[PDB]
Amino acid sequence: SLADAVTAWFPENKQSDVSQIWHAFEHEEHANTFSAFLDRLSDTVSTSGFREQVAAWLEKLSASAELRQQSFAVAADATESCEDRVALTWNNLRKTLLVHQASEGLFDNDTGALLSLGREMFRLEILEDIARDKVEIEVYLAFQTMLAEKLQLSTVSGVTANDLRTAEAMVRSREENEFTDWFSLWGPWHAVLKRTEADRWAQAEEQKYEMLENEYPQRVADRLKASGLSGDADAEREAGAQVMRETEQQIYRQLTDEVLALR
Amino acid sequence: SLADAVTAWFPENKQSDVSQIWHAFEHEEHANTFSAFLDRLSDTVSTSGFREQVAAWLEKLSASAELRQQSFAVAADATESCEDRVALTWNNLRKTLLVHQASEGLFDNDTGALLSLGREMFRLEILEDIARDKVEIEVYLAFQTMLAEKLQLSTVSGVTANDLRTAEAMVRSREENEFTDWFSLWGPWHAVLKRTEADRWAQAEEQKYEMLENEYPQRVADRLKASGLSGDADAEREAGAQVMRETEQQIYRQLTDEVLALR
C-alpha cells in the first residue's frame, strides 16, 4: 500500500509518524498507482542525499491536497503508460517464442498453425500502423482489445465505435494485399525452411550469392546513373539496400509459393 | 527475487516444485529485471485462463537456456525503458511543484531563485530537442546525467565524449537566443505575476481582450487574403492560433522586461 511506499524514504525517527499521516489518503484517486511509482523510483540508487530530497518533496504533498492531487495524477499517467508497454512486451515475448518453437521443430509438418499464427502477428503489425498516424500508442492497445474477437487475436474509453469499422476493413484489405509477401520474410517461417526443405534452402541462398556478385553491382550503378547520383554513399547505400530488400522479397516469395503447394 | 515471481502463476500443487527449479537461474543476466516484469504483468487481471497461459509459457523457459536468454533480455529492454520514463516523470513532478510553490508565494520576492530554476527547466527542454532528431530517448537521459555538473542540473554508455561538446555549446547558444522569451510564457512565472504585480496583470489581460476583438479578426483575414486561402478552417484556425501565440509572446515579453528592471 501507499503508507509503506512513502515511509521507506525517511529515517527511523520520522518513519513511524510519517506512516501515521499518509494513511488518510489510502483511498484517494490514483493512490493505488502513485505507491507503485515510489517503489520504482526507489530502485535508482545508481547515491547519497537524494532520498533526503525525495522525502522533503513527499512532506510537501502531505500539506497540500491540491499539489498531491496533481502529483498523484502525473505519476498515474506514467504508470498507465508503463502498463501499456508491459502489454506490448508480451507480444514481443510471443514473437520470440514462435522463433524458438519453429527452430525446435514444433511446426515442422504443422504449417497450418504457423500460417494461422503468422496472420495474427501480421494483423498486430497493421494495427501499429493504424496508430502511428492518429498522433498515446495506448490507442493501439485499445484497438487490439476490441478487435480481439473480430480479427481473432489471443492477446468505450479510447476512440469512436465506428473507428473500429475502418481499421478492421483495412486489416482485411492489407492482409489480402501483403501477408503472403510478408510471411515469406518471416523469421519463424525461415526457421521451418532450414529444417524441412534444407535442399530447397540451399537453392535460395545460392541465388543470393549469384544475384549479389552478378546483378547487384550493375543494377545499383544503372539506377544511380538514371537518377544522376554517382557519388556519396548516401545515394549508393540507400539504393543498394532496396535492391537487396527487393531481391529477397522476390526469391523468398517464389520459395514460399513452391512449398505451400506441397502443403 | 525471481523464484517467487515465477511461482505466483501456478496452482498450489505445482507451486513448491516450480519454485525449486527456478532457483538455479537466480544469478543469470537480466534475472534481476525479468522478475520485476512478471510482477508488473501480474497486475493486469482486467480474467480467467490467462494465468494458465503464462504459466504454460513460463514452463518453456525452464526447458531452454536459449529461449530464456532471449525472453530475459527482451523483458529487460522494457524494464530499462520503464526506468527511463520513471526518471523523466520526476522532472514533470518537479515541474508541478514549482507551479504550486510559486502560487503558494514561495518566490513572491525571490525572483532570483525562480529565474535560476527556470534556466534549469529550459536547458532540459533543449536537451529534449537534442534527442528528438538523433533517432531510445534514453539518450536524453544520458545527456542530462553527464551535463549535470557542466550545465548545473539537479536531476561512457550512450554516445561519444565529443557529442557532449556540441550539445552544451548549443544549450549556451539557445539559452541566449530564447530563454527570456520562453520564461515570459512560463507557468510558475505567471503564478508570481498574479500574486505580486496584480495591477500590472490586469494591464496585460485587457490588452489581449483589446487585441482579440480589434486586431485579431482583421490580421488573420489579411494574412489569409495574402496567402489565398479564404476558406476551410484548416487554413483559418492554423493561422489564427499563430497570431494568438505571437500576440502572447509579445505582450508577455514586454511585461517580463518591465518587472525584472524593478527586480
Side-chain angles (χ1 to χ4, degrees):
Chain A
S1 71
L2 179 68
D4 305 318
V6 176
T7 197
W9 292 91
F10 293 85
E12 261 76 298
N13 42 292
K14 293 176 182 178
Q15 211 108 29
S16 187
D17 39 334
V18 158
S19 186
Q20 284 181 56
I21 298 157
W22 278 82
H23 217 90
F25 316 121
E26 291 284 77
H27 263 280
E28 286 179 342
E29 201 190 43
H30 312 300
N32 178 51
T33 53
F34 184 86
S35 41
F37 175 82
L38 292 158
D39 290 344
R40 296 206 287 133
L41 190 70
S42 190
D43 295 302
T44 324
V45 74
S46 304
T47 184
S48 300
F50 178 73
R51 283 181 70 258
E52 300 150 31
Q53 191 190 335
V54 180
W57 170 75
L58 270 165
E59 280 170 316
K60 297 200 180 72
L61 268 72
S62 310
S64 173
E66 190 185 322
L67 168 67
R68 195 183 61 258
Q69 144 67 39
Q70 298 290 286
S71 302
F72 269 40
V74 186
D77 206 304
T79 318
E80 193 191 28
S81 291
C82 275
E83 292 190 75
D84 291 328
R85 308 273 200 287
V86 158
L88 213 162
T89 317
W90 178 252
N91 289 303
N92 302 304
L93 260 35
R94 200 173 164 190
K95 213 264 109 177
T96 313
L97 188 74
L98 295 170
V99 172
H100 190 89
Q101 285 187 325
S103 61
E104 271 296 289
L106 197 84
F107 303 98
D108 278 350
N109 38 51
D110 201 16
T111 321
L114 189 75
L115 203 71
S116 181
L117 283 157
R119 287 186 183 273
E120 190 175 340
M121 297 305 298
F122 181 80
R123 295 161 185 167
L124 289 177
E125 261 204 14
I126 232 80
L127 260 45
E128 280 192 299
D129 302 314
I130 260 78
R132 277 262 92 112
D133 62 336
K134 305 282 181 178
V135 290
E136 198 68 278
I137 49 85
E138 54 199 56
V139 62
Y140 158 83
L141 189 272
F143 272 108
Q144 184 186 302
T145 315
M146 303 284 175
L147 296 163
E149 188 195 23
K150 202 158 283 178
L151 287 175
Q152 303 153 319
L153 271 50
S154 183
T155 309
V156 65
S157 82
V159 280
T160 331
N162 62 22
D163 285 337
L164 297 165
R165 316 292 84 246
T166 322
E168 186 212 347
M170 299 191 293
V171 181
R172 307 262 90 261
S173 181
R174 282 196 69 178
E175 197 165 321
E176 195 183 62
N177 202 35
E178 291 97 309
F179 178 66
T180 315
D181 297 75
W182 171 86
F183 188 80
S184 304
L185 298 180
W186 202 33
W189 174 232
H190 289 137
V192 181
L193 286 179
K194 303 162 198 173
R195 289 186 54 87
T196 315
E197 309 294 309
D199 300 307
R200 270 167 158 161
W201 181 258
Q203 167 81 347
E205 288 297 301
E206 280 195 64
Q207 284 178 30
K208 284 209 289 178
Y209 262 87
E210 188 270 314
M211 215 144 292
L212 189 140
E213 198 204 45
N214 191 100
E215 288 174 37
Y216 172 85
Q218 172 68 239
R219 219 155 84 259
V220 169
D222 56 37
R223 202 199 219 93
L224 208 71
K225 188 263 212 295
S227 191
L229 287 164
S230 301
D232 203 294
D234 274 22
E236 295 200 27
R237 281 186 272 98
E238 194 181 310
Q242 195 214 322
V243 183
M244 276 191 285
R245 262 187 281 102
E246 276 311 310
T247 47
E248 280 189 312
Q249 181 60 76
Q250 253 87 131
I251 292 167
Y252 295 135
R253 176 70 200 269
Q254 332 288 343
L255 213 184
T256 309
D257 290 325
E258 298 274 61
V259 298
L260 262 56
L262 277 82
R263 286 149 276 112
Chain B
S1 71
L2 179 68
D4 305 318
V6 176
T7 197
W9 292 91
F10 293 85
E12 261 76 298
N13 42 292
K14 293 176 182 178
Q15 211 108 29
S16 187
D17 39 334
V18 158
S19 186
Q20 284 181 56
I21 298 157
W22 278 82
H23 217 90
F25 316 121
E26 291 284 77
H27 263 280
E28 286 179 342
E29 201 190 43
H30 312 300
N32 178 51
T33 53
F34 184 86
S35 41
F37 175 82
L38 292 158
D39 290 344
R40 296 206 287 133
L41 190 70
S42 190
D43 295 302
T44 324
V45 74
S46 304
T47 184
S48 300
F50 178 73
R51 283 181 70 258
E52 300 150 31
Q53 191 190 335
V54 180
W57 170 75
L58 270 165
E59 280 170 316
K60 297 200 180 72
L61 268 72
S62 310
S64 173
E66 190 185 322
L67 168 67
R68 195 183 61 258
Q69 144 67 39
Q70 298 290 286
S71 302
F72 269 40
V74 186
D77 206 304
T79 318
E80 193 191 28
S81 291
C82 275
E83 292 190 75
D84 291 328
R85 308 273 200 287
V86 158
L88 213 162
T89 317
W90 178 252
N91 289 303
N92 302 304
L93 260 35
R94 200 173 164 190
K95 213 264 109 177
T96 313
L97 188 74
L98 295 170
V99 172
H100 190 89
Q101 285 187 325
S103 61
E104 271 296 289
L106 197 84
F107 303 98
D108 278 350
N109 38 51
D110 201 16
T111 321
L114 189 75
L115 203 71
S116 181
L117 283 157
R119 287 186 183 273
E120 190 175 340
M121 297 305 298
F122 181 80
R123 295 161 185 167
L124 289 177
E125 261 204 14
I126 232 80
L127 260 45
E128 280 192 299
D129 302 314
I130 260 78
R132 277 262 92 112
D133 62 336
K134 305 282 181 178
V135 290
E136 198 68 278
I137 49 85
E138 54 199 56
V139 62
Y140 158 83
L141 189 272
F143 272 108
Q144 184 186 302
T145 315
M146 303 284 175
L147 296 163
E149 188 195 23
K150 202 158 283 178
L151 287 175
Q152 303 153 319
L153 271 50
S154 183
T155 309
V156 65
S157 82
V159 280
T160 331
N162 62 22
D163 285 337
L164 297 165
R165 316 292 84 246
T166 322
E168 186 212 347
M170 299 191 293
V171 181
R172 307 262 90 261
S173 181
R174 282 196 69 178
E175 197 165 321
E176 195 183 62
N177 202 35
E178 291 97 309
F179 178 66
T180 315
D181 297 75
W182 171 86
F183 188 80
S184 304
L185 298 180
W186 202 33
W189 174 232
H190 289 137
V192 181
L193 286 179
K194 303 162 198 173
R195 289 186 54 87
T196 315
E197 309 294 309
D199 300 307
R200 270 167 158 161
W201 181 258
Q203 167 81 347
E205 288 297 301
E206 280 195 64
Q207 284 178 30
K208 284 209 289 178
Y209 262 87
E210 188 270 314
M211 215 144 292
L212 189 140
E213 198 204 45
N214 191 100
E215 288 174 37
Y216 172 85
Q218 172 68 239
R219 219 155 84 259
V220 169
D222 56 37
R223 202 199 219 93
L224 208 71
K225 188 263 212 295
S227 191
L229 287 164
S230 301
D232 203 294
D234 274 22
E236 295 200 27
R237 281 186 272 98
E238 194 181 310
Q242 195 214 322
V243 183
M244 276 191 285
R245 262 187 281 102
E246 276 311 310
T247 47
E248 280 189 312
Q249 181 60 76
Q250 253 87 131
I251 292 167
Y252 295 135
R253 176 70 200 269
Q254 332 288 343
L255 213 184
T256 309
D257 290 325
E258 298 274 61
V259 298
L260 262 56
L262 277 82
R263 286 149 276 112

